[PDB]
């Protein structure tokens, strides 16, 4: 239940963003022109937030009680804080190169990029329009109405159940995987925007989850949280194996794919297929000899069979397949102890981070001191304190 929003909160958040902006202008990182483009995103979401504050000049109560705007603002501060902890957590390894810290800064950057997309999507020109937000693919557009009416955002549980009615979600881990795919903003909430994107990416709706398991969960080709520059960097090791390719979410064309292949002449190119489902693109490209080695791999999964009335049976996907898939995204905000909830507490005398849920779960079973350094607890504290 995210609370009411008001200028003081928005400005609270704006100070934490500036902190993050200051962390990233460090030259040792040269992020001035790195794909998600964080030093452009924070200033940009800040500047758009002011616009929202302007359009609601005098209607700040209305705005402040908007479920979406409330969930948004909560998540924006949560994420600007993960970032701050990230730089503090990993220290100099941040200025390394190809390091986990920096790997996570990019995942986060990618999230900020999506967050700002969703924001501009729901608050075009500053005015809230989520209740009239136009889902692109009519079939999905129905599912949403008939299930959330004009709702701009729904809890993961509500969405998952609503979806299960029409697209059976096999089991436990499948739902988790499906979630780290649709929850672009990573806030356990699914927005009408987040939904429109996902339903475009994995069209046609008629086979929504079949497509999603064949293209993303299992397909060695699919890459999660990758930017234009990381693809180029990844395909580098196959620059001598023309035909090697990988695909991912386009960042400047949300809801569209970006395929990166190595050419005959040994170059790495990237394209955003026009008017056609990813799999027709991948089948055709394969047939035409362009896409042959998913992430370098020699066997290229057959996607024919995502075609015509009542298209085949459901591929089997192990619990291991889903686990490996989930480990693709986020995770760094996750608590090492349970590996499922966000770290939200910093044990104090020492300093270990962990989800409050576990801290509480350990003490209740009488576990001596800190779960990490079995040292005395004394007091807890926010992983990242509010701006002073």
């Amino acid at each position: 239940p995210p609370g009411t929003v008001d200028k003081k909160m928005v400005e609270k958040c704006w100070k934490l963003m500036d902190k993050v902006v200051r962390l990233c202008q460090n030259p040792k990182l040269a992020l001035k022109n790195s794909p998600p483009y964080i030093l452009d995103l924070l200033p940009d979401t800040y500047q758009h937030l002011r616009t929202i504050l302007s359009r609601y000049e005098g209607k700040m109560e209305t705005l402040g009680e908007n479920e979406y705007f409330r969930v948004f603002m909560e998540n924006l501060m949560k994420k600007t804080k993960q970032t701050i902890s990230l730089f503090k957590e990993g220290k100099e390894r941040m200025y390394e190169e190809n390091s986990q810290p920096r790997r996570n800064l990019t995942k986060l950057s990618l999230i900020f990029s999506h967050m700002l997309a969703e924001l501009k999507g729901i608050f075009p020109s500053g005015l809230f329009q989520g209740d009239t937000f136009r889902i692109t693919k009519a079939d999905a557009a129905e599912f949403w109405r008939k299930a959330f009416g004009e709702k701009t955002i729904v809890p993961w549980k509500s969405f998952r159940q609503a979806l299960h009615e029409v697209h059976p979600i096999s089991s436990g881990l499948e739902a988790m995987a499906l979630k780290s795919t649709i929850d672009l903003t990573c806030n356990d909430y699914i927005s009408v925007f987040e939904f429109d994107i996902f339903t475009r990416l994995f069209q046609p709706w008629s086979s929504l989850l079949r497509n999603w398991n064949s293209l993303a969960v299992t397909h060695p080709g699919y890459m999660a949280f990758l930017t234009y520059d990381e693809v180029k960097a990844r395909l580098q090791k196959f620059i001598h194996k023309p035909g090697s390719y990988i695909f991912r979410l386009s960042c400047t064309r949300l809801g569209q794919w970006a395929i990166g292949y190595v050419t005959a002449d040994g170059n790495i190119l990237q394209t955003i297929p026009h008017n056609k489902p990813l799999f027709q693109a991948l089948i055709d490209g394969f047939r035409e000899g362009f896409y042959l080695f998913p992430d370098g791999r020699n066997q290229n999964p057959d996607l024919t069979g995502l075609c015509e009335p009542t298209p085949q049976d459901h591929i089997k996907v192990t619990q291991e397949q889903y686990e490996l898939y989930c480990e693709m995204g986020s995770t760094f905000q996750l608590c090492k102890i349970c590996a499922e909830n966000d770290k939200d507490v910093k044990i104090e005398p020492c300093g270990h981070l962990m989800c409050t849920s576990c801290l509480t779960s350990w003490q209740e079973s009488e576990g001596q001191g800190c779960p990490f350094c079995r040292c005395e607890i004394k007091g807890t504290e926010p992983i990242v304190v509010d701006p002073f």
Binding site: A258, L269, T271, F290
Partner: peptide
């Protein structure tokens, strides 16, 4: 910087 090209021939 970047570059998105047309879909393969």
């Amino acid at each position: 910087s970047d570059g998105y090209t047309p879909e393969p021939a």
